């Protein structure tokens with residue numbers, strides 16, 4: 127990550143961009159597994175093996191409350207969603223596939239956000 131991403135405080139304008147990025151991911155056809163916290167009734171061992179769970183609704187709450195101070199912190203929460211999924215599930219599961227697709231989409235949108243900050 128470059129110096130702007132790590133060190134430039136998030137402004138109000140930056141927060142309008144983060145809201146738009148998050149809404150784009152929530153609207154993606156392959157986002158369904160990640161919209162809300164993992165349901166322990168459907169995976170009874172999940173919370174014993176994933177120590178820091180994350181989901182898009184938790185990220186939306188954090189965005190609304192201005193939790194994030196730097197872009198790197200927002201990217202770290204998003205990345206946790208995908209990394210938790212690829213560690214818990216095998217490489218041939220549909221959950222793993224959704225993580226592959228949605229992370230690629232996130233990177234496309236994140237590059238767009240970074241470009242608009244600087245020009």
Ligand SMILES: CC(=O)NCCc1c[nH]c2ccc(F)cc12
Pocket residue numbers: 159160164165168169172210211214215221
């Ligand atoms: C987002 C994520 O990684 N989900 C995995 C855990 C999970 C949720 N619902 C399920 C239903 C059946 C199953 F075998 C596992 C699960």
